[PDB]
Each structure stands twice: as structure tokens, then as C-alpha cells.
Amino acid sequence: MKRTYQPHKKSRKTTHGFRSRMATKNGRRVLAARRRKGRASLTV
Amino acid sequence: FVKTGDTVKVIAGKDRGTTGKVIKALPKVNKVVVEGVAIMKKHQKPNSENPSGAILEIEAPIHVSNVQVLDKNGVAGRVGYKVVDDKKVRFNKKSGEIL
Amino acid sequence: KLSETKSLLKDLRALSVEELTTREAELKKELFDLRFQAAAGRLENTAKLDEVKKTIARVKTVQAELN
RNA sequence: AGCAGUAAGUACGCAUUGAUCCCUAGGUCUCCGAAUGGGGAAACCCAGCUGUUACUAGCAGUUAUUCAUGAGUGAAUACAUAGCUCAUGUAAAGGUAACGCAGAGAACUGAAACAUCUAAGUACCUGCAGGAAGAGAAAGUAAAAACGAUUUCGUAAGUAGCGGCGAGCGAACGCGAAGAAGGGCAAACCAAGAAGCUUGCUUCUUGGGGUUGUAGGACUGCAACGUGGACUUAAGCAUUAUAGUCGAAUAACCUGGGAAGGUUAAUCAAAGAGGGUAAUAAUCCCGUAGACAAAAUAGCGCUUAUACCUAGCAGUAUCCUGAGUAGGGCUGGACACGCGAAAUCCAGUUUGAAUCCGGGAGGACCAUCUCCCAACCCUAAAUACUCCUUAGUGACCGAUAGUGAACCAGUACCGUGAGGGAAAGGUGAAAAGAACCCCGAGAGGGGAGUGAAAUAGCACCUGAAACCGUGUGCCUACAAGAAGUUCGAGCCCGUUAAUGGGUGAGAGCGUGCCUUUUGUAGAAUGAACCGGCGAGUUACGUUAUGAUGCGAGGUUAAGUUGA
RNA sequence: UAUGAGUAGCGCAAGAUAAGUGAGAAUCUUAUCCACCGUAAGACUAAGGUUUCCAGGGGAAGGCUCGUCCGCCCUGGGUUAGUCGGGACCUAAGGCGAGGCCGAAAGGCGUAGUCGAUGGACAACUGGUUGAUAUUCCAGUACUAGAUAUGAUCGUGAUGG
């Protein structure tokens, strides 16, 4: 039937935008894990 | 080396002892196209700049080991260089010293 | 040969930006119709692009920087 | 001496006049991002002010906040105050390899279960710091003469101890080595000021005073020692990174596609390290050993007066010497210490001294003795670890290895996300990459030619293995087998030259292999096959057995030296 | 790399002939009939998709078969606004939140304020136009708002009400 993601643009951001991830002193930490690994991109 | 140059011996390799003029070495290749030496031939298509092709007597480059610069009396060896004058003087050992 | 003359000659003298660089940071700072011959074609001669931008470049970064 | 990164790939060109390039310094530095004029989902939008220069423009800058410092303001409510405004100071927010410190802090385990313990105050998480951090100068240890801050290592030694005394955990002393530096302040006082100026003030500001254990300072005596210590300033010296430079020593023959290989000879010597070169080089090249070179470049070190605060000393008028402080109660915790005889230290909470005739420690505690002087602050050095910069080294490893990643790897790809996470290197020396000719819609082939070689032709060295084949000598279409032996009719062929091999009709007798089990042929498992990987170590300790050495004498650890 | 196995399936609906195309046509293109849907299987429009569009060329793979065809591939173009939707307006639900509050810390709360549309504010609509853009390009008509050029005159009249 219905599946999980049928997102819109607000949906694809607003959990994972750079200030959203940056905001709570925590997601920016795991982003810095994502930087200290340094994969294909950062914010998505 | 420093820019070749002159007639240049080929001791080892496919054509022993052959001397031949150089100017066109491009030392980044680290092996020098010399006229007469390492006779490549190319079967090129009848295309632009040769509408027959099939024959290109361009010649292969061979290594710095098989390049042997002689001083002008046909005497090779080891280039003692920079020794004498204002910027640089090239010569070989046991040689007539000219460049 | 050409470029050391036609580069080193120009504006190492200390006259100024709206003063001396009138030929470069004003006049040939119109990079139009040389670029604008770029991609219009019918030019056949390249080196003027980064040559001239190089000269206006050194005009700004020396002469329009030293004051 | 060519340049015109990657690399083909092109063009204008460019260049020993000195390019390209290397190094050093300066320049500009799109936007986002601590990200900060304001908002905002990352690559945005909209501004204000100041000049600019022109426009219903543009340019250039200023405009985040907190803190600190001033300046002004001035509510209830008179002063004030809060509050507000402006100005100044990256300060400072932030990114962070690893080590540290401090807080907060588990579980799983193991204890054959487990509630005590352990794991460990470790996993995590947060903060604070530097090149190291803490670390530290006895209110110490010890127990007799016994020394004299720390720190690291060895030792003591699993010794003393503690512990459902289970399981475990676990010292210190003293000694040995490295490293080896202590110095200020408050206090007391003295002088200045201002002031409770309520006078004699007894609080503040400045500068001396001096930092103490056998007490020491103040009071009476009275001496100028470089000092990271009594100034780790500035000026020269010297040399290193930071561009690199020179830099020795050989010829022929044979072979091959090619010599450095074989052969013949010769040289060199601070260079016979290593790597290339068509095939293994000392004498071909890079190099190598040595010997030179830097303006700027970041330093290190030496000399210089200066960059400043200290001494001894006898006596003792009284003061000082570190108050909610020691302590005491309770609750904790750490200390080997699990409340215990429990030391000793540090917490909360409560109570609360003495103060030099002092006070503390000496594992409850009371006396004698030993030592020390807390309750104020700083202290290099020896140590820990590397993202990093090279100089490098390998009984490292060779493309399933070695980093996940030798390859445009954290790539592709999965997942919304946090995350995860692949596969793959080799032609030939040199592309010299197969001109042409022919087949073929094209590809692809086939000739030619290429190259040492074309089974060498672009995922290309080498090429098994399973799979598919094509040919091949024998046999089988009256046969019901772990698919075998052994014998063997008959046929075919002639060999690591051998009492040859390939067969094989026929005929006798013959229950696959692994783990488990008492016993499996198995209808007990398991294995599609093929290839690759893929599993009993070492660290430290004990015991046993030998080997060797010396022997009631064996033995050096740590460390130092050194490649 | 087998095997099963040239077996299952070939992903819910009917095309047909002639002619072209090519080298090769069932499946490409046209013509001509048939057929189907038709409160849709039309057109237009959210989110989404992120260039898939169109033009030309080609057919290594892809297309579940073929394949000259193509959402496949190469190349090149293609999206146009004062009024259309948003922003330069306001604001809910909510989020962030200087101040402040408490808290080992991080934090979590929160006054002012700040954004936050699915809401409420407001001018343009007819005709033509490509391979493709149309309310956007232009003919005709506007209107909105501002500007500088120009006889006002005391007028504007606020965050207050």
C-alpha cells in the first residue's frame, strides 16, 4: 500500500538542514563526526 | 642531461655506436628522439595532413643511458659541468672539453 | 622575449590608479569586444585574454593596492 | 631549455635576453560557515548609516552578542539606584589528532547462580588546558642517628594488607638509576595619605618589612655576593631549517630484439647505499660519500652592561605566622582499607577552638621521645601521546594482502536520517595501437604489414579450475553397479625403455566421505562445484623436562654507554 | 561455473492491410478503416520528479523480444511578469528566544521580540505567437504604486484611541 516517504521540500529539510543539524550542540557533533570521516557531502 | 645538442653516441641497445644530431630532447621524456636512431615507422591512415599515410619515419626515443654526448672531437664520457666559466661550462671526461 | 618587455615596461612607476591606470583600470578595463569577440569567434588569436587580464590584474594588485 | 598541470588536445602563442619551474614574502582574497546589520532550510533575501559617484543605481566600508572599561542618562522617588544610550578593548565566542586534568558516570562480566565485591570509577558524556598536563617544596616518612620537595623506572613483591576473607583486589617503607631549583605574599610592623576625619580616627590606598622550626621576622645590632635564582630585556656573535650547488672512477668481444648477462682487459676510492636503463652496472644516468649555498625565512645557542630582588649575624619589648580553621557529632567517599580497633585525608551538615609556654603527625587512644609548622600562592627538568614536518628502518605485505580505500574511496550503492559500505593494478622496451586490401548494415573478422614475438591487438604479462566443446584408438543399444578392484578374451598404440601403455567385453568379490553415537551405509547431519582466504599464538608469570655455563657460589635488574 | 532449462514467465486491453523507411521491419512512419475509454483511459493543476521537453544524429548497453523508434545515447536549443505564486506586508498552530527562571554541566523553560501559510491583506485581460514560451513575447485597452518635472496652502493627521 502506502509507503513511508512521499516527502516534500519542507519534509526533506527541517530535520536535516544545516541549522537544524547544527542547532542542538549535538547533531553538529555527529556532523563533525561526518566531517572527521569526511564522506561525499555533509548536510544531507 | 643539459640540452642536447650535438651528435650523440648510442653505446648499448639496438643500434650500437650510432651518432646523430639532437636539439629536441625534452628531458622530461627522459629518453631522446634522435634522427637516424631507433627508426620507428608508422602505418598511418590516409587522413588529414597525410592523405596516404602508411609510412611515418618518425623515430623512437631511447634512454639517457643510451644517449652519449661527445665533445666536438667525437669523444664521450661523463659530463663534468659548470666548472670553468661565468654560468656553466660543459665537458666530458678524457675529452676535448668543448661543450 | 616579447612578454618580458611588454610586461615589465608598463607601470612599475608610482603614478596612480585613476591617474596612471587610466589605460588599464579604465581604458582596456573595457575588456569588451575582445572578450565579446570571445565566443563571437572571428578572433583567431588567443593570448590577449589572460595576457590583458594579467596586465590589468597586476595593475590592480600592485598599482591599485600600493596606496 | 624549453613552457603551454592531469593526458591525450587543441590553438594562439610563449621562452637561455632568461622563460616554464622551485623557494620566500606581499597582494587580492566570490558566498556560506564561530558566521555576527536583520531575517532565513548552506551555497539566500531584505536593509540602515558614512563618504563615494550617480542613480528611482552602483562602489567602498560601519551596524550580531556577552564581558570589561569609561562617558552620559536618570523611573517609582529628592539625590541615588535600577534601567537606558554611546564609546573603547577579537577579549571571545568557534574548528580541534592524541595525551592530561576535573566533574558526571554505568552495565555486561566474573564470582560456576547471585544480593557483598569485581568488572572500574572503566564504556560513555560534559567542561577545562598546554606541549605536555597535572606535579611539588615536609603542619613528610621512619624508628634508629633517619633522612630531607617533587616526578619516572627497577626493586621491595602480590611483600604488608583488605576482602560473602569467596572470587579477587591490592601496598607503602627503605634502596638502586635518571632527573636533579625553589621562590614569592598576606600577617606582624614602619612610613605616607584619606578617613569613623565622631577629635587621639583604627578602616581603606601606596611603598618598605619578611615568609619562618628547632622557632623566624618585626625592635636593638648589620652584609651587596647576576639571579630562569638577586632582572629567563635589548645589542652583537655563531649556526640550523628555509631554494639547492658541485661532486670521481671503462673499453672491446659472444649472445640475443636489446648487454649491465657470459668473455677479455683497465680504472677509481669520503662515492661497490639505492633506483632506473628493452637483460642482473661501481666505472651509463640519477645519485651516492664528501665539499660548498640563501638575501627572507623561522629559529636555537654564546658574550655584553642593562631588563631587579634576595643574604649572614647576636639579642628578644611585645605582636605575627594563614578561624568557622583544626576539631567534635552524623551522613558519605577516597586512601590496600568492604565501619572496622580503625588510622590519615577530602566532601555535605552541625557545633566549635587554641594560637609560640603554641599547634600537629607518629594507623583507637593516654604519657615520654622523633619529626614538622598546615589551614595563602606560584615552580622548569626528567613523563604521556601523535593528526602533523621530514630523515628514514624493516627476517612488514604484496592487489581477498597491505588503510574501508595501491584504482578520482569513504567512491558507487543502500537507508529519510543517524549510519553503513563495495568491486577493480599490470599490453608492448617503445603505441611503434594493426596503413592498406577484402568480407561484413555496422561491429567483428580475414589477409597484408607492425613489433623479438599478434595465442601480443587495447578490461593486453602468465594462464589452471569447474563449464562448454571439436576431433580422435577401443567398447557399449538382453543391460537392473558407491560405478570398483582382480583376472582377463579381444582390439589399438608404442614409453622418465620400461616384466610397455591405452582400452576394455566377460567373470569373481566388493554399503561414499564427515561430526555424533552404544551402534549409522543411511530414510541422522552436512557438503552444488572449482580456486583463493580461513583458525592453538605470543605479552608477562609459574611448574616440569632436558641443553649449556659455572658451582655453595650463581646472578646483575632497572639504568648508562654505544650503530 | 553448473543445475533445473530451452521449461516457467514474457508484468490485466485488439488492431488491421497497403505504401514508405531502411540493410534489415510486425513491433519505425504515414494513409485508410476498425476498436477502446470517455465523472475518463480527457484538461489543468498541487506536492513530487529534477531537464526527463524539443530539434538533429546514432543504436555500446537499456527497452522484458525485435527494432531504423524512444523518457536510451551524442550534440544543440528550449522556461521571459509592475499585475501570475512567494518574498521586500501581517499572523495563527508552532519554533527560537536577549532579558529572567531554575538546574552537575550540556541544558530545559520563558517576558519583550523574532520568524514561521495551509490563512488575511492587492493592479491585466483579450487576440496572435513557435520546435518549444506565454496572463510573461507583441496589437488593443488598462489599472496599481512611485518618481522628477507643477497653481497647495497651514495639512498631515500616530505604535495611542
Coordinates of N, CA, C and O (backbone and C1' of nucleotides) in Angstrom, one line a residue, chain D residues 399-412 422-426 459 531:
Chain D
rA399 P 49.7 -10.0 -4.8 O5' 48.1 -9.9 -4.6 C5' 47.6 -9.4 -3.4 C4' 46.4 -8.4 -3.7 C3' 45.6 -8.7 -5.0 O3' 44.3 -8.6 -4.7 C1' 46.4 -6.5 -5.0
rU400 P 43.4 -10.0 -4.4 O5' 43.2 -9.9 -2.8 C5' 42.6 -8.8 -2.2 C4' 41.6 -9.2 -1.1 C3' 42.2 -9.8 0.1 O3' 41.4 -9.4 1.3 C1' 40.8 -11.4 -0.9
rA401 P 42.1 -8.9 2.6 O5' 43.7 -9.1 2.4 C5' 44.3 -10.1 3.0 C4' 45.8 -10.0 2.8 C3' 46.4 -8.7 3.4 O3' 46.8 -8.8 4.7 C1' 47.1 -9.0 1.1
rG402 P 46.2 -7.7 5.8 O5' 47.0 -6.4 5.4 C5' 48.4 -6.4 5.6 C4' 49.1 -5.3 4.7 C3' 48.5 -4.0 4.9 O3' 48.8 -3.3 6.0 C1' 48.6 -4.5 2.6
rU403 P 47.7 -3.0 7.1 O5' 47.0 -1.6 6.6 C5' 45.8 -1.6 5.9 C4' 44.9 -0.4 6.2 C3' 43.5 -0.5 5.7 O3' 42.7 -1.3 6.6 C1' 44.4 1.6 5.2
rG404 P 41.7 -2.4 6.0 O5' 40.4 -1.6 5.5 C5' 39.1 -2.3 5.4 C4' 38.2 -1.6 4.4 C3' 39.0 -0.8 3.3 O3' 39.4 -1.7 2.2 C1' 37.2 0.5 4.1
rA405 P 41.0 -1.9 2.0 O5' 41.2 -1.3 0.5 C5' 40.1 -1.1 -0.3 C4' 40.1 0.4 -0.8 C3' 41.5 1.0 -1.0 O3' 42.0 0.6 -2.3 C1' 40.1 2.5 0.1
rA406 P 43.3 -0.4 -2.3 O5' 44.4 0.4 -3.2 C5' 44.7 1.7 -2.9 C4' 45.9 2.2 -3.6 C3' 45.8 2.2 -5.1 O3' 46.6 3.3 -5.6 C1' 47.7 0.9 -4.5
rC407 P 45.9 4.7 -5.9 O5' 44.8 4.3 -7.1 C5' 45.3 4.0 -8.4 C4' 44.2 3.6 -9.3 C3' 43.0 4.5 -9.3 O3' 42.5 4.7 -10.6 C1' 42.4 2.2 -8.8
rC408 P 42.6 6.1 -11.2 O5' 42.0 7.1 -10.1 C5' 40.6 7.2 -9.9 C4' 40.3 8.0 -8.6 C3' 38.9 7.8 -8.2 O3' 38.8 7.8 -6.7 C1' 39.4 10.1 -8.7
rA409 P 37.6 7.0 -6.0 O5' 38.0 7.1 -4.5 C5' 37.8 8.3 -3.8 C4' 37.5 8.1 -2.3 C3' 38.7 7.7 -1.4 O3' 38.4 8.2 -0.1 C1' 37.1 5.9 -1.5
rG410 P 38.5 9.8 0.2 O5' 37.0 10.3 0.1 C5' 36.1 9.9 1.1 C4' 35.3 8.7 0.7 C3' 33.8 8.8 1.0 O3' 33.1 8.1 0.0 C1' 34.7 6.9 2.2
rU411 P 31.6 8.4 -0.4 O5' 31.7 9.3 -1.7 C5' 33.0 9.5 -2.4 C4' 33.1 8.6 -3.7 C3' 31.8 7.9 -4.0 O3' 30.8 8.7 -4.7 C1' 33.6 6.5 -4.3
rA412 P 29.3 8.6 -4.3 O5' 28.8 7.3 -5.1 C5' 29.0 7.3 -6.5 C4' 28.9 5.9 -7.0 C3' 27.6 5.1 -6.7 O3' 26.6 5.4 -7.6 C1' 29.5 3.8 -6.2
rA422 P 33.8 -1.9 2.8 O5' 34.1 -1.1 1.4 C5' 34.4 -1.7 0.2 C4' 33.2 -2.4 -0.4 C3' 33.6 -3.3 -1.6 O3' 34.2 -4.5 -1.2 C1' 31.6 -2.1 -2.0
rA423 P 35.5 -5.1 -1.9 O5' 35.1 -5.2 -3.4 C5' 35.6 -6.2 -4.3 C4' 35.2 -5.9 -5.7 C3' 36.3 -5.3 -6.5 O3' 37.2 -6.3 -7.1 C1' 34.4 -4.1 -6.8
rA424 P 38.7 -6.5 -6.4 O5' 39.7 -6.3 -7.6 C5' 39.3 -6.6 -8.9 C4' 39.3 -5.4 -9.8 C3' 40.5 -4.6 -9.8 O3' 41.5 -5.2 -10.7 C1' 38.6 -3.2 -9.7
rG425 P 43.0 -4.6 -10.7 O5' 43.0 -3.5 -11.9 C5' 43.3 -2.2 -11.6 C4' 44.8 -2.0 -11.8 C3' 45.4 -2.9 -12.7 O3' 45.2 -2.6 -14.1 C1' 46.8 -2.6 -10.8
rG426 P 45.1 -3.8 -15.1 O5' 46.6 -4.0 -15.6 C5' 47.3 -2.9 -16.0 C4' 48.8 -3.2 -15.9 C3' 49.3 -4.2 -16.9 O3' 50.6 -3.7 -17.5 C1' 49.9 -4.9 -14.7
rA459 P 41.5 -3.3 -22.3 O5' 42.4 -4.4 -21.6 C5' 42.8 -4.2 -20.2 C4' 41.8 -4.9 -19.3 C3' 41.3 -6.3 -19.8 O3' 42.2 -7.3 -19.6 C1' 39.5 -4.9 -19.2
rG531 P 39.9 -27.0 -6.4 O5' 40.5 -25.5 -6.3 C5' 41.4 -25.1 -7.2 C4' 41.5 -23.6 -7.2 C3' 41.8 -23.0 -5.9 O3' 43.2 -23.0 -5.5 C1' 40.1 -21.8 -6.9

